[PDB]
Structures are given as structure tokens and as C-alpha cells.
């Protein structure tokens, strides 16, 4: 791919630098699909009503089904629309106007019917996809189980093959399932026993297509979530659910592969979902700051608000660049393994979302802290973005370990910038130097730590941060170079944003790479471990009160 060879200090300037171009006909088609959707979202959708009631109105859901937003990426042969990865990110920005709809739709498309598309047979697709895309049925992804006296990642769900060998019997329970109260098709993963020539009792994960009509499927009341109150997050329990043997995704025992595919396929589009929401904040907050007076001056004339607006714009620019670069690398013929880049986009997008939303709410002062303005609701809604679709600290470990595994294979096997515009020359040299230093540091880390690198979660965080910054730099460089070359309107603003982000990211990566050495005095991780270990063994704050006295 691109990120995996970033670990080796090599820039693959063949897949990333010519920015994904879309032909005129596809642009006209996507613009024609837009309209009836954007107008509906701006006018006929009441975000305040959905948030305050906690339930999406049936008229809104019916119109969403009519628009075909439940089958965006379903192939056209199965009642869907067959939109590509750069045309789904485009619609994500419009859909993001609710928060309670961008979660209901994504959990039905990205992690829902996606399993049937990826691993279902031609006869399973002809049965479930036509009704899943039409919106009559809704899909849910059931993977995790409630950790109560047991591990939080292992699967305790059981599927026992019947005596007559005609259907499995499923017993288990799942938690935090989106659309649990609405879904009619469940993609459930359960551990089933497999007997082989060895004659063991080894069990493997297997994916099922469980319908609510099968019987024995019950769910509780929805959770009382902070921000996305229009969503329906329940916990689903399967009590002796009879699943026909034909309703198995792929082959028995091949459930881990399907789960990995579904999880890794649907994280790239978050960066445009939020960048379409950040751009909405730069419009209302700009109006407020330009129509308000303080100290006989505009709020827009004060440096500490200009910095906030510039930071928001830079974040949105980098997010859009990342998302469309990733979606363009995913649109290549075949099947590229661009799963690290999706996690990068998710992490960067969630962090930027939280920071920029809080800062924009701070711009309005005390008026944005009330429930009469659309910043309280947005502030509550973007907090789930650091948890929805993988926790941000799990994904840093995913990125670092997935890259270091490839780097380790390459190193063991070995042991045993003329694309950018000349105006973007001060930022490409920084990117190349940071990539070379990252490759050298990764080689040093792999040599020194080896298999121990699995335990060191503070080194992997720095590696993931450096790689995310490198991805941001290359995405913004590609977009700015394309804008200069073609000659789009206001490309000097794009160049300014790209240069500013490249400088900031270069400084951050320089610090992080300085902290990744044996003899680095700036490294505070042997001291953080001691403090945290003492705190956690006492399970409370340790330092005495400043007023304490000793005889």
C-alpha cells in the first residue's frame, strides 16, 4: 500500500501523489443525486426535534428510505445504487447534518449489510440485499458481548450444530449494538466447535445471518446516550435461535476473516463526515463573530478568534484531503489493503472534531452553552466519534503493530519529490526528511525491542502519531499540487493551509522522533509508569494535602 512502506522510509510516489481525479460524467451524476438529498437534509430534517425527542420521526425515516440512502453502496443489481468510495464520502458530508442519522445509516451500511456484500454467496445476496437496500429491512453488527467477570474482547457466544445437521442453535448476548431495536437482519459472530483430522475440540469464530423471524431474538430498552439521542443502541440476546445452515457467511470457522473485513472496510469516510460538519461551524460562527461588537471592534478583528478560525479551516482541509485520498486509493481495481489509512483518518478526524467543536463553542462564549443554539447538541454529538467505530487508543496500536509487522518481515528477509509544485518545495523536503527519519527510527525500534514492542504501548502511540502526521502531510501536498496544476479557484488559500499544516506536523514529528531514542532526556515514560503503577495499586490519589502536617 502506502502506509506499510512508509515504515521502511520509502515514499511510494505512484499511488498517492497524483490526486484521485473524477471524470466529468461521474461528477454530474453525483451532483444530480445531490439536490433532492441536500434540500431534504437542510429543510425537512429537524435535528433539534430528533435530539429532544430521542426518536427519529417515521416520516423522516420513510423519506430517507425513499431517497435510497439505505443502499448507497449496495450493487445496482441488488436494488442499491452501487456508489463508489469517493461518492459515498461525498454524501457523508450532507448526511452529517444530523448526527443521529449519520450513525443509524453508517451502522446499517458500513458495518451492517456490508458483511453480506463482502462474504455472502450469490444466493444470499439475492435474498437479503434487495430488501436491505430498499430500507424495508435494517442490518446490525453483533460482535461484542457484555464483560461481566470475563474478558471484554473474547467471544462467549455459542452455536451448536443440531442432531439432524439441518440448522445451528445459537445462544449468547451482545451489547452496544446499534439499530438493535430496528434491525431485522443480524450479522452475529459466535464460537462454534470444529472437528478435524486431529480430532480436537478446537472452536472457531463463525459469522451468521440471523433474522428476527428466526425466533428467540430479544433486545432491551435503548441506552441513554449523551449526544446521539436519535439512534437506537440496544443489547440483543439470542436464546436458542435456530439458524439454517445455509445462513453462514462464507465457510464455518471463517468468521474472523469476515469480521476483520467488515471492521477495516468502513472507517475511511469519517474524515469527510466531520469536515462537512467543521465547514458548517466556520459558517455560523463566522456570522456570529462578524455581526457582533466588542471593544468597538468586530470579533473577527481579534487575533485569538482568527487563530480559531484558521485552525478550524486547516483541520477541515487536512481531513478532506485524507478522506478523499484514502477513498481514491480504495477505488483502484482489485482489492488494496488500505486498512491503516482508514484508522489514521478515523483518529485524526475524531481528535480534530472534538478540539474544533469545543473551540467553536468557546467562540460564542456563554450563548453557546445554552440549548437554544446548535452548538450544545453538536458538542454532545461529536464525543461519540472518539468511541464509535473503534476507540482512538486501540486504533493507534492497530496502526503501529500492523505497520511494524510488515517492517519486521521486510527486515528479517533482508537480514537473513518532483510531483509537488515548486511553490510547495519547503514542505516536501520536510516530508521526505521526516519519512527517512521515521524509517530509521522504526528500524532501530525493531532491532532494540523485537517481540517486546508488543508490550510498549507508549512507543507505539508515538509511532502512530508520526505516521498519521506523515499521511496528513502527503495528502495535503497532493491536494495542493493538484489545485495549483489544474488552477482551481482560490488555490493560494489551499497552499497557505498546506504549508502551515506541514510546518506544524514537521515540528511535532521532530519532537516525537527525538523522544524515540535510548538516550533521550525528553522521554518521560520510565517515570510515568512508576507514578501510574503507584496510583493504580492504591486505586486513589496518593499525594497528601498541601495543608498536611507531620510531627
Amino acid at each position: 500500500a502506502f502506509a506499510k512502506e512508509l515504515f521502511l522510509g520509502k515514499i511510494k510516489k505512484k499511488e498517492v501523489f497524483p490526486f484521485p481525479e473524477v471524470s466529468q460524467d461521474e461528477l454530474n451524476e453525483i451532483n444530480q443525486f445531490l439536490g433532492p438529498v441536500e434540500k431534504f437534509f437542510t429543510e425537512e430534517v429537524d435535528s433539534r426535534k430528533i435530539d429532544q425527542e430521542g426518536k427519529i420521526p417515521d416520516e423522516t425515516l420513510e423519506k430517507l428510505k425513499s431517497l435510497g440512502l439505505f443502499g448507497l453502496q449496495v450493487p445496482e443489481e441488488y436494488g442499491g445504487l452501487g456508489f463508489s468510495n469517493t461518492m459515498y464520502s461525498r454524501l457523508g458530508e450532507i448526511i452529517s447534518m444530523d448526527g443521529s442519522i449519520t450513525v443509524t445509516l453508517a451502522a446499517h451500511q458500513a458495518i451492517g449489510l456490508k458483511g453480506i456484500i463482502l462474504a455472502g454467496t450469490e444466493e444470499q445476496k439475492a435474498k437479503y440485499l434487495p430488501k436491505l437496500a430498499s430500507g424495508e429491512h435494517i442490518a446490525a453488527f453483533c460482535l461484542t458481548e457484555p464483560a461481566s467477570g470475563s474478558d471484554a474482547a473474547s467471544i462467549r457466544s455459542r452455536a451448536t450444530l443440531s442432531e439432524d445437521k439441518k440448522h445451528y442453535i445459537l445462544n449468547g448476548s451482545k451489547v452496544w449494538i446499534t439499530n438493535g431495536g430496528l434491525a431485522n437482519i443480524f450479522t452475529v459472530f459466535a464460537k462454534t466447535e470444529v472437528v478435524d483430522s486431529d480430532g480436537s475440540v478446537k472452536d472457531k469464530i463463525t459469522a451468521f445471518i440471523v433474522e428476527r423471524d428466526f425466533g428467540g431474538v430479544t433486545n432491551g430498552k435503548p441506552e441513554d446516550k449523551l449526544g446521539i439521542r436519535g439512534s437506537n443502541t440496544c443489547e440483543v440476546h439470542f436464546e436458542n435461535t435456530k439458524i439454517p445452515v445455509e445462513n453462514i457467511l462464507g465457510e464455518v470457522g471463517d468468521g474472523f476473516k469476515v469480521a476483520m473485513n467488515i471492521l477495516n472496510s468502513g472507517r475511511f469516510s469519517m474524515g469527510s463526515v466531520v469536515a462537512g460538519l467543521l465547514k458548517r461551524l466556520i459558517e455560523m460562527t463566522a456570522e456570529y463573530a462578524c455581526t457582533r461588537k466588542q471593544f468597538n471592534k468586530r470579533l473577527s478583528e481579534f487575533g485569538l478568534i482568527q487563530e480559531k478560525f484558521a485552525l478550524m479551516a486547516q483541520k477541515a482541509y487536512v481531513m478532506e484531503s485524507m478522506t478523499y485520498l484514502t477513498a481514491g486509493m480504495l477505488d483502484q481495481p482489485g482489492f488494496p489493503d488500505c486498512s491503516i489509512e482508514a484508522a489514521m483518518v478515523k483518529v485524526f478526524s475524531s481528535e480534530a472534531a472534538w478540539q474544533c467543536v469545543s473551540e467553536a463553542l468557546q467562540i460564542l462564549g456563554g450563548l453557546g452553552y445554552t440549548r437554544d443554539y446548535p452548538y450544545e447538541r453538536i458538542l454532545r454529538d461529536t464525543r461519540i466519534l472518539l468511541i464509535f467505530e473503534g476507540t482512538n487508543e486501540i486504533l493507534r496500536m492497530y496502526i503501529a503493530l500492523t505497520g511494524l509487522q510488515h517492517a519486521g518481515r521486510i527486515l528479517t528477509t533482508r537480514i537473513h519529490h518532483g510531483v509537488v509544485h515548486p511553490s510547495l518545495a519547503d514542505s516536501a523536503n520536510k516530508f521526505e526528511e521526516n519519512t527517512y527519519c521515521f524509517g530509521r527510527t522504526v528500524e532501530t525500534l525493531l532491532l532494540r525491542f523485537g517481540k517486546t514492542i508488543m508490550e510498549e504501548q507508549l512507543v507505539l502511540k508515538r509511532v502512530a502519531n508520526i505516521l498519521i502526521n506523515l499521511y496528513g502531510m502527503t495528502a495535503v501536498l497532493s491536494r495542493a499540487s493538484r489545485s495549483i496544476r489544474i488552477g482551481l479557484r482560490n488555490h493560494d488559500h489551499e497552499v497557505l493551509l498546506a504549508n502551515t499544516f506541514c510546518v506544524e506536523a514537521y515540528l511535532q514529528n521532530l519532537f516525537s522522533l527525538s523522544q524515540l531514542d535510548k538516550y533521550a532526556p525528553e522521554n518521560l515514560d520510565e517515570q510515568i509508569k512508576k507514578v501510574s503503577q503507584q496510583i493504580l495499586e492504591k486505586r486513589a490519589y496518593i499525594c497528601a494535602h498541601p495543608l498536611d502536617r507531620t510531627c
Binding site: 467471544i155 469480521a259 503493530l401 511494524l404 519486521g408 525493531l446 517481540k451
Partner: peptide, 15 residues
């Protein structure tokens, strides 16, 4: 490992 924890991030690096 139960080959289920590998979904969150890879485990048991083969170096």
C-alpha cells in the same frame, strides 16, 4: 490467543 483479540490489533508478532 483466542484469535478473536486480533480484531482490535495484531498480537503475537512473528519477528
Amino acid at each position: 490467543t483466542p484469535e478473536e483479540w486480533n480484531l482490535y490489533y495484531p498480537m503475537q508478532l512473528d519477528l
